[PDB]
Amino acid sequence: RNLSALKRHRQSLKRRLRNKAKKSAIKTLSKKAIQLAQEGKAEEALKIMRKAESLIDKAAKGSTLHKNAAARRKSRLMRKVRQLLEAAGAPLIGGGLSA
Amino acid sequence: KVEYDLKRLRNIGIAAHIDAGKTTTTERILYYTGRIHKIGTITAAVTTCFWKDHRINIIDTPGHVDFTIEVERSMRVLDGAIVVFDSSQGVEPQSETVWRQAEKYKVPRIAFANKMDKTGADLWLVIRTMQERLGARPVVMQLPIGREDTFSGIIDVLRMKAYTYGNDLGTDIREIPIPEEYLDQAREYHEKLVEVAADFDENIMLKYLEGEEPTEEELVAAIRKGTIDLKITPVFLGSALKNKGVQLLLDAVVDYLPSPLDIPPIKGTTPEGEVVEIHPDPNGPLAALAFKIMADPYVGRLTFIRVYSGTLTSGSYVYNTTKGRKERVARLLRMHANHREEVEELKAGDLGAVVGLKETITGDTLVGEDAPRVILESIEVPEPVIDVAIEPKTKADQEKLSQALARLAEEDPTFRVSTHPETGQTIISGMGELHLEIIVDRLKREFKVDANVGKPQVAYRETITKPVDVEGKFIRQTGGRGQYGHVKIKVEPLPRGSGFEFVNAIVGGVIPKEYIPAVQKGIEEAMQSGPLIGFPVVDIKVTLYDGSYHEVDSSEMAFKIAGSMAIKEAVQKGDPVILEPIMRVEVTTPEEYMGDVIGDLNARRGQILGMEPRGNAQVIRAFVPLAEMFGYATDLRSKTQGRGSFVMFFDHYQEVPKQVQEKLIK
Amino acid sequence: GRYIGPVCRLCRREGVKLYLKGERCYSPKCAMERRPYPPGQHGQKRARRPSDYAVRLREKQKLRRIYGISERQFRNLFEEASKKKGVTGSVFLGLLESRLDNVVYRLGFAVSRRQARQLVRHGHITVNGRRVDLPSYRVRPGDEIAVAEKSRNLELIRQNLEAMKGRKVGPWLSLDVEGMKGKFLRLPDREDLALPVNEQLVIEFYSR
RNA sequence: UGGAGAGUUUGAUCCUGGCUCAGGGUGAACGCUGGCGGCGUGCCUAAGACAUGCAAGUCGUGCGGGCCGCGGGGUUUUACUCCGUGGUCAGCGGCGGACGGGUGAGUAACGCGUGGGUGACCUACCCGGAAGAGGGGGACAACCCGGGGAAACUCGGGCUAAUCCCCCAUGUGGACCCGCCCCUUGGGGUGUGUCCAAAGGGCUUUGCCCGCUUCCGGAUGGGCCCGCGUCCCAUCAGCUAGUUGGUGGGGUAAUGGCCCACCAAGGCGACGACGGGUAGCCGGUCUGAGAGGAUGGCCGGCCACAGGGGCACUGAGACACGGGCCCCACUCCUACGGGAGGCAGCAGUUAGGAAUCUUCCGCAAUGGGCGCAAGCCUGACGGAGCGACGCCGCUUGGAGGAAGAAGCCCUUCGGGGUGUAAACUCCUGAACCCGGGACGAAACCCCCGACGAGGGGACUGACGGUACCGGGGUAAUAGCGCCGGCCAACUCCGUGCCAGCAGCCGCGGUAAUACGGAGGGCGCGAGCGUUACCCGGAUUCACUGGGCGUAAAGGG
Numbered sequence A: 001r002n003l004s005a006l007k008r009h010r011q012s013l014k015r016r017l018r019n020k021a022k023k024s025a026i027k028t029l030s031k032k033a034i035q036l037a038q039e040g041k042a043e044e045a046l047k048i049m050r051k052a053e054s055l056i057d058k059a060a061k062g063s064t065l066h067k068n069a070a071a072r073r074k075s076r077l078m079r080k081v082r083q084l085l086e087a088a089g090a091p092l093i094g095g096g097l098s099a
Numbered sequence B: 001k002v003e004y005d006l007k008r009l010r011n012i013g014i015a016a017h018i019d020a021g022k023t024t025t026t027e028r029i030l031y032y033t034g035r036i037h038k039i040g041t042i043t044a045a046v047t048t049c050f051w052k053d054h055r056i057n058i059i060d061t062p063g064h065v066d067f068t069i070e071v072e073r074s075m076r077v078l079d080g081a082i083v084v085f086d087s088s089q090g091v092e093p094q095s096e097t098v099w100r101q102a103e104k105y106k107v108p109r110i111a112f113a114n115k116m117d118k119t120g121a122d123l124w125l126v127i128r129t130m131q132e133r134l135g136a137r138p139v140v141m142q143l144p145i146g147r148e149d150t151f152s153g154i155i156d157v158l159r160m161k162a163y164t165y166g167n168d169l170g171t172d173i174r175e176i177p178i179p180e181e182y183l184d185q186a187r188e189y190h191e192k193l194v195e196v197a198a199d200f201d202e203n204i205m206l207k208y209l210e211g212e213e214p215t216e217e218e219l220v221a222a223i224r225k226g227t228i229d230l231k232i233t234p235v236f237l238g239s240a241l242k243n244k245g246v247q248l249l250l251d252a253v254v255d256y257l258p259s260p261l262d263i264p265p266i267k268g269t270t271p272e273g274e275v276v277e278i279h280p281d282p283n284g285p286l287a288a289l290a291f292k293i294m295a296d297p298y299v300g301r302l303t304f305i306r307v308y309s310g311t312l313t314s315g316s317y318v319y320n321t322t323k324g325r326k327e328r329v330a331r332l333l334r335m336h337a338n339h340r341e342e343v344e345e346l347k348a349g350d351l352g353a354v355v356g357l358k359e360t361i362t363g364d365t366l367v368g369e370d371a372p373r374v375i376l377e378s379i380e381v382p383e384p385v386i387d388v389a390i391e392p393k394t395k396a397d398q399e400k401l402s403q404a405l406a407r408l409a410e411e412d413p414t415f416r417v418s419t420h421p422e423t424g425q426t427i428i429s430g431m432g433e434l435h436l437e438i439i440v441d442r443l444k445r446e447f448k449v450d451a452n453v454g455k456p457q458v459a460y461r462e463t464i465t466k467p468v469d470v471e472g473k474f475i476r477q478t479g480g481r482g483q484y485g486h487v488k489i490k491v492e493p494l495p496r497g498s499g500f501e502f503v504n505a506i507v508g509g510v511i512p513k514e515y516i517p518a519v520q521k522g523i524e525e526a527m528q529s530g531p532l533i534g535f536p537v538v539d540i541k542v543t544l545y546d547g548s549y550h551e552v553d554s555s556e557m558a559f560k561i562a563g564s565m566a567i568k569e570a571v572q573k574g575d576p577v578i579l580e581p582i583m584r585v586e587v588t589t590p591e592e593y594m595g596d597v598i599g600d601l602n603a604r605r606g607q608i609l610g611m612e613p614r615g616n617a618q619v620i621r622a623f624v625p626l627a628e629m630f631g632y633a634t635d636l637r638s639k640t641q642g643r644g645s646f647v648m649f650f651d652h653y654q655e656v657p658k659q660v661q662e663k664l665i666k
Numbered sequence C: 001g002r003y004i005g006p007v008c009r010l011c012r013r014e015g016v017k018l019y020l021k022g023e024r025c026y027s028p029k030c031a032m033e034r035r036p037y038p039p040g041q042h043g044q045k046r047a048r049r050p051s052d053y054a055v056r057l058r059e060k061q062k063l064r065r066i067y068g069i070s071e072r073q074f075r076n077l078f079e080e081a082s083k084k085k086g087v088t089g090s091v092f093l094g095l096l097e098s099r100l101d102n103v104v105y106r107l108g109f110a111v112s113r114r115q116a117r118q119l120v121r122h123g124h125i126t127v128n129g130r131r132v133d134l135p136s137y138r139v140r141p142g143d144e145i146a147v148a149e150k151s152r153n154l155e156l157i158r159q160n161l162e163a164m165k166g167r168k169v170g171p172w173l174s175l176d177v178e179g180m181k182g183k184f185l186r187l188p189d190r191e192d193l194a195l196p197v198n199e200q201l202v203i204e205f206y207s208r
Numbered sequence D: 001u002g003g004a005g006a007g008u009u010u011g012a013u014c015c016u017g018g019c020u021c022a023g024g025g026u027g028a029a030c031g032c033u034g035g036c037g038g039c040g041u042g043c044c045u046a047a048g049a050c051a052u053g054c055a056a057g058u059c060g061u062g063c064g065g066g067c068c069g070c071g072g073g074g075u076u077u078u079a080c081u082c083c084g085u086g087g088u089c090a091g092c093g094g095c096g097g098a099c100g101g102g103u104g105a106g107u108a109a110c111g112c113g114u115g116g117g118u119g120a121c122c123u124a125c126c127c128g129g130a131a132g133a134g135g136g137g138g139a140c141a142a143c144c145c146g147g148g149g150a151a152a153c154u155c156g157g158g159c160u161a162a163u164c165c166c167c168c169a170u171g172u173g174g175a176c177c178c179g180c181c182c183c184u185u186g187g188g189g190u191g192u193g194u195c196c197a198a199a200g201g202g203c204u205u206u207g208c209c210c211g212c213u214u215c216c217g218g219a220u221g222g223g224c225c226c227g228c229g230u231c232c233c234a235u236c237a238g239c240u241a242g243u244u245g246g247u248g249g250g251g252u253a254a255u256g257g258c259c260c261a262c263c264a265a266g267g268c269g270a271c272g273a274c275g276g277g278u279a280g281c282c283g284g285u286c287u288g289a290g291a292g293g294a295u296g297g298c299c300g301g302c303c304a305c306a307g308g309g310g311c312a313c314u315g316a317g318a319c320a321c322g323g324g325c326c327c328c329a330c331u332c333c334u335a336c337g338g339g340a341g342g343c344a345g346c347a348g349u350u351a352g353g354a355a356u357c358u359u360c361c362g363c364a365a366u367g368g369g370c371g372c373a374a375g376c377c378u379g380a381c382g383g384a385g386c387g388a389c390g391c392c393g394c395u396u397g398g399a400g401g402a403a404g405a406a407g408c409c410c411u412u413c414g415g416g417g418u419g420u421a422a423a424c425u426c427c428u429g430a431a432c433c434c435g436g437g438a439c440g441a442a443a444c445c446c447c448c449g450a451c452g453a454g455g456g457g458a459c460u461g462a463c464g465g466u467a468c469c470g471g472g473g474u475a476a477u478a479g480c481g482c483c484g485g486c487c488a489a490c491u492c493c494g495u496g497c498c499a500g501c502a503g504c505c506g507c508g509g510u511a512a513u514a515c516g517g518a519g520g521g522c523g524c525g526a527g528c529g530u531u532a533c534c535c536g537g538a539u540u541c542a543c544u545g546g547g548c549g550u551a552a553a554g555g556g
């Protein structure tokens, strides 16, 4: 009548539910960063972005993200942020963005 | 690991005239033999149930109701049978029948008195009938404590113990000794019993005379050895609804009811022609009969079969000799009271259903796929008795109907469909009102076909009284292919049932040789649509005694018309008379009912012809008009409550009462 | 199955004598020896000239009747020789000739092909060891046709094997009456087979 | 190494030209016959609906428990039942359920075929190479207790294990932005900054086995693009708004209007757009001298779809055939409060139809998943079954035997035929018997070795007591078509334009090789005939290979 493969569904649900979160985590955070960066908060933006970054490659370990999933995100994050901090700010603190 | 000794097998049938308790009786039997309940619907013809290390097959269905036929079929296969009787229905006119059509075949059967709780429930009354009507030799086997409303327990004479039933849900039973009074009543019947069994076992006779009492084991042997011969019929009892007398009648089963082996062999025929017994040896050729096909949702087409010889195996190969067809039996199967026990083979004497087979319809004899290709008996011949006109409304429905019987004829070969070979309308051959009636529901519902239900027509005939002679001229002479034909004939009426006679009354040959054939095909022809209604003008002699011709004008055709004219008018002129069909019918009826029976027949445009007795009954013969002869079934069984039967044959045609001449002018 | 039924009939018809029987046809009575003419009721009458078709048919039926062999089989082997590399005419005979049931008769183990085939069937024959029972077996060049052992001393074998001391066998065959042997030297050849049959016709016949 | 024609317009002729026939081929069906066996092949119609069973699982060498059989019993006897291990039950976690198998509905299209491009990418498992595996926290099932239930199950507390999750570390080294270098669509470097590793089991226990982590390569499989090739209809002629391009964003493994926003008016079409029908494409198949025509069953490749539609989740992979969510349709149980579903898997049921099979045996082999293994699962597959459905082989007898029985048929009554046919005579002996009886199966495992080579050793057959072999061994199924010409094969009797035949031309109207029977004959033979469909014949769409004064055909 039935098959124990829903075991797979039960999981299907867990995992989704997991990464669902670190997913939306980095999301919001990704934003809080670039927000500042643009707003002018030179270093305190760099800060957050330094964090976001981690949380990303961090997520990339598992199955949430992967391949360039992360690296793409980054090449945009610490792309635009430096592309908003040039709105007259001079990269303050030694956040991720390299000299 | 035997579980099949055969002498442990009980194939039985529940028969009886309606009302009774047949059906309800069965489901009950199927709750006792299988209440089981351990800390571990007649769902298809025959079913198995176990009662004290004995496997029983039951096939409740009888009904009596008009159409027996089927009853008389299971009957042929089964070995024993319980003729349920309704205690209550005591001025019982229909307790009969059922049986008198049992000994008909030759099978043993015990009695059961079902409603010993319902009003008029008077045991004896029945016996004052079961020997007065049919007249068997029953033997009282029980005496109920509390007639009808006061239904409590029972006593078995043979075994002189008293039982009780404290309720009717089927729980609080018990074997409580005889209650004060009654007792005495017993004795005597318990002596007669033994006295009755004396007529079988001499042993139980001399010991009767000496003063010694017969052993409960030799006493049984008597009773049993007496039933089996169709001499005696053990009568028992109990409200089947109150769950009473059953668990005890269940014993009554085995203890007296025949085992496949006490049964007399079926005869079968070689492909050449010669009888021969078919031995119930589960090791001889494989011969099994079939008896009932059924469409299952779950497994599909099912062929319930009664094995006689050899032993079928699940997933083998058979051979229906009947329709010389090589079937591949795939699956074997036994019907348990609530599930489908898939067995692996069926040894001679046993019953169940096989799945597979497509060409095996009813009554088909199945042997082994190499065995001597033999065919059993089975040949029963119960034709129909009541039919009706069915015109399938607009030609649309006329089709749904075609399928209607194209599947309904296979799903019930107790009928026949006939399209009046002269005039569209189709008859529905039945065997009793109800019969055809319930088909009118299925055939009209499950087929959604919606048509008309009148009665057949009658094959009337045209002729005349006075003989006449008219001219047959034709001629059309205008300018070339003249068309010149003329003849004169002599028309003369003939005895109803004379036929067709013409007369080459032409001398030298005033009417050239080449044309006569043509003047006959013309005359012959015309005689088709009567001068009155348009019916076969017949019973006449025609005399061509004159007529001329033209050398050039005449035509093979010109003559055919001229002759078709003399005919088309001599009838008109010699005063036409609407002949109709008369039948020969013979009603077998107990001169009891006869009185009115004859009446009825007289008030039916018919005139009596005699009555030379038959059986214990009496036959009456006479003629009748098919018109006032329709649905005679439900009229003969009226004047006779069932005890009536008739036949019918055509014989001649004959003139209508004139008042019925202008009747037909429509 | 290989026909069965009146033979020294066909002997006739084709009007070109055949030894379907073997011995007897030799005697004054191959049928055609007595009444050399197509059978039936009519038979002996001035015959209308045959058509272009009738002709080739009869040459086929002749060639095929000789080897006694189902048109089916007959056709297959032709439809084989054609595509086969080599002058088709010859070729066709070539295989036809390599039938075991034939090689047997040729070898003289059997008075008639009718007979030879039965022998073949009943394993009275052997090839290089393993007996064969398929008349249709096709002999390659360089095989020993011998009589089985259980057989060897069975009347028939002898009498026929007997008249063999003397009688020749095809330049393509070498026989040893003692050991009841016989090799298939080479693929028989056009002339080697002296037949009252014309292959060209027949071919033309399978060209329509 | 390859090409056949013939019947039919007339009084006669020649031409043109239609019609017709013989040939092959079939997943076939139908008729009348029907003996054996091998290898094939068997829903072509309703992608209509479907009872039942089985078609996907497996690891205890990842982890904690419940129950049950063993050790030793905890206590003084069973008690609060602990302990080490092997079954089990489900729960965890690990892989596998995306392969395999089915089907042709859709689709005229980068779907397919082919041949290429990825400075536009991905690849679990498997090889090779390099470096590692350092610390801490942390919950949820299982379980207990408790509630609601007919049922499916469901809700609430509280524990706890791990190769489950999570933080910090170290980073061989990898990811990003910036600068420079080579390069040339995003490819390789290189420095600053910044960010990220990990898991533990078994044993014989600092050493192996199996795992883990990161990075580089190998391999295999893919994603995507592009040129060319891929049907009928102009009595479908114009089509287009995310429409064509652009910038920036999103999105992805990755390119891209794949999406969003905004700008620009562009993009396509008689080289046939758009619209409408039909169809899965190819290897191949049949036919054909060839070109060419048809075709696409089984087998192999690719695609698509799994009731119809929409959607995402998990994941290396899927928008998932036996997963999930919503709409809709159908199917079922119901204590009617609410549950359970999808045979185009294997087999079968029903309906439809002219028609297409067994709810079969075996995991013996091959092949697949999980496991260190033993081993488990495997309707994949290997076999059996029914069917002249096809093909191939074989048999119903062989040799004698009359100027030639009989019967029957024809007769000019002389006789002619059936016909060596029978008879009769010998001889071989299918079937069928007793007996014997496989190959497919040698590894995984285990032992020497070094758990490498190599050597030895053990357990392994569904078919199957089948094939096949030796001994015995009886004369042991024939049909069907046709007999005017094309076309081989002719007489008698019936019949009288009747009944009937018939592909064509045409037969039948009292002496018919054309109807119907008989005798006889011809062809073929477990088959013979018919009916569908495709090629051929048909140079009758002509490239090969045709034509237009009057035959059809020159446009005023």
Ligand SMILES: CC(=O)O[C@H]1C[C@@]2(C)[C@@H](C[C@@H](O)[C@H]3[C@@]4(C)CC[C@@H](O)[C@@H](C)[C@@H]4CC[C@@]32C)/C1=C(\CCC=C(C)C)C(=O)O
Binding pocket: B042, B060, B061, B062, B063, B411, B412, B414, B438, B439
């Ligand atoms: C269950 C059984 O054994 O009999 C049942 C079933 C029954 C024998 C039925 C009577 C009659 O239809 C029978 C026929 C021939 C009716 C016609 C078809 O439909 C047949 C396929 C069917 C077979 C059995 C059936 C259907 C019964 C009756 C019917 C009585 C009717 C009334 C109005 C009381 C009965 O027994 O009373």
Ligand SMILES: Nc1nc2c(ncn2[C@@H]2O[C@H](COP(=O)(O)OP(=O)(O)O)[C@@H](O)[C@H]2O)c(=O)[nH]1
Binding pocket: B016, B017, B018, B019, B020, B021, B022, B023, B024, B025, B063, B114, B115, B116, B117, B118, B238, B239, B240, B241, B242
């Ligand atoms: N009261 C009562 N009724 C009974 C009993 N047996 C049968 N019946 C009634 O008989 C009637 C018909 O029953 P059934 O067995 O179907 O009749 P059958 O089919 O003609 O035998 C129903 O009304 C039942 O209630 C009984 O023992 N007691």
